[PDB]
Amino acid sequence: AEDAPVLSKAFVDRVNRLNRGIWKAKYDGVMQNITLREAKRLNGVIKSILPKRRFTEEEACAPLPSSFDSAEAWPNCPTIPQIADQSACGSCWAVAAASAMSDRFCTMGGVQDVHISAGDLLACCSDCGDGCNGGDPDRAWAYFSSTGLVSDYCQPYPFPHCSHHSKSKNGYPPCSQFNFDTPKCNYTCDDPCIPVVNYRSWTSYALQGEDDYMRELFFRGPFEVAFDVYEDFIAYNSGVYHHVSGQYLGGHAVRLVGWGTSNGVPYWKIANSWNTEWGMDGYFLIRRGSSECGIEDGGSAGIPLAPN
Ligand SMILES: *[C@@H]1O[C@H](CO)[C@@H](O[C@@H]2O[C@H](CO)[C@@H](O[C@@H]3O[C@H](CO)[C@@H](O)[C@H](O)[C@@H]3O)[C@H](O)[C@H]2NC(C)=O)[C@H](O)[C@H]1NC(C)=O
Numbered sequence: 497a498e499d500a501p502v503l504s505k506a507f508v509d510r511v512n513r514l515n516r517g518i519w520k521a522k523y524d525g526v527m528q529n530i531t532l533r534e535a536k537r538l539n540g541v542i543k544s545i546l547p548k549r550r551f552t553e554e555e556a557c558a559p560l561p562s563s564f565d566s567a568e569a570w571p572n573c574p575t576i577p578q579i580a581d582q583s584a585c586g587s588c589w590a591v592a593a594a595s596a597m598s599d600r601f602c603t604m605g606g607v608q609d610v611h612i613s614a615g616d617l618l619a620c621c622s623d624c625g626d627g628c629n630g631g632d633p634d635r636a637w638a639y640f641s642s643t644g645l646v647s648d649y650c651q652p653y654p655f656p657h658c659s660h661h662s663k664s665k666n667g668y669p670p671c672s673q674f675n676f677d678t679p680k681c682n683y684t685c686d687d688p689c690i691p692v693v694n695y696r697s698w699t700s701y702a703l704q705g706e707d708d709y710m711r712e713l714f715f716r717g718p719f720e721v722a723f724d725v726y727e728d729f730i731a732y733n734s735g736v737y738h739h740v741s742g743q744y745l746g747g748h749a750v751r752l753v754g755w756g757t758s759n760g761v762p763y764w765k766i767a768n769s770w771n772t773e774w775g776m777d778g779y780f781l782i783r784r785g786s787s788e789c790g791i792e793d794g795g796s797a798g799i800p801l802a803p804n
């Protein structure tokens with residue numbers, strides 16, 4: 497919509513009063529100057545076609561710990577702790593998907609360090625939606641099953657790191673300088689001397705509800721979920737987020753990596769795709785148990801097929 501800032505000092509003071517200090521909002525952080533049009537661009541979920549996940553008796557009746565972190569449970573899987581940067585696209589549906597697929601190749605696929613190409617998925621799955629104008633996480637995982645995806649060695653993400661800060665500590669260029677269209681779908685690597693290797697799942701499925709989410713995470717590792725983004729979330733700095741003010745900005749896809757309790761408040765730990773400058777080093781904590789902003793309404797996951 498507008499070139500009107502999403503944040504104001506008055507808006508953030510209201511938020512910090514209404515949230516009762518359970519989470520901290522910050523006006524003069526990395527998102528201070530973000531525009532209503534740029535904020536809505538980050539939120540690329542539009543629009544089940546996947547079968548519902550079925551647990552065995554042993555999976556369903558296992559006593560889950562009160563704390564869990566995917567990076568500590570699989571300390572030899574180096575993709576889990578890495579933070580993506582979707583850049584100036586509505587590519588979150590594809591970026592969260594490709595991140596969790598990279599992680600599952602190590603947790604289940606016998607491959608320690610492969611990065612699945614978000615670019616390949618964004619550009620070639622026309623059935624998933626319309627690239628940087630948004631798309632459907634469930635269709636992304638169905639595409640990983642039927643067609644498959646190259647690694648980011650074959651097809652690196654086309655859009656560079658960008659900052660919303662004036663002086664980025666990482667020295668990234670501003671995101672205000674960029675506004676990207678869906679890349680072309682290619683059938684060779686960007687360097688055609690790198691041979692094409694196709695990576696597939698043998699099964700893809702849907703999840704619903706706190707219990708399903710914790711069991712899937714514990715047994716199989718990170719997966720893709722989505723929630724409603726309101727203006728207050730843009731200002732998130734630390735603590736367990738819950739919505740208290742601001743208008744609806746769209747659906748956003750993210751990567752669930754953990755859960756815990758912080759001073760009696762249950763949370764999910766989540767890897768965002770807005771680089772390591774935003775939130776808690778690229779992470780946020782959100783309230784678990786009550787489907788906060790619909791986060792527990794729909795997850796998408798799958799089992800990578802081991803190569804050869
Ligand atoms: C499929 O292959 C094409 C290569 O033909 C990729 O599109 C190209 O993407 C690169 C970035 O990776 C673009 O480079 C940029 O050029 C602009 C000028 O328009 C400039 O602002 C930047 O400095 C940057 O270097 C290039 O424009 C673009 N070319 C074409 C013909 O589309 C595409 O990204 C590949 N798709 C995937 C999914 O990998």
Ligand SMILES: *[C@@H]1O[C@H](CO)[C@@H](O[C@@H]2O[C@H](CO)[C@@H](O)[C@H](O)[C@H]2NC(C)=O)[C@H](O)[C@H]1NC(C)=O
Binds near residue numbers: 526528
């Ligand atoms: C948001 O933009 C404002 C200005 O529009 C930035 O504040 C200025 O930053 C310059 C460097 O670019 C400083 O030298 C000035 O002291 C600041 N001027 C004013 C008028 O405040 C601000 O840094 C931007 N915020 C973020 C976090 O990027």
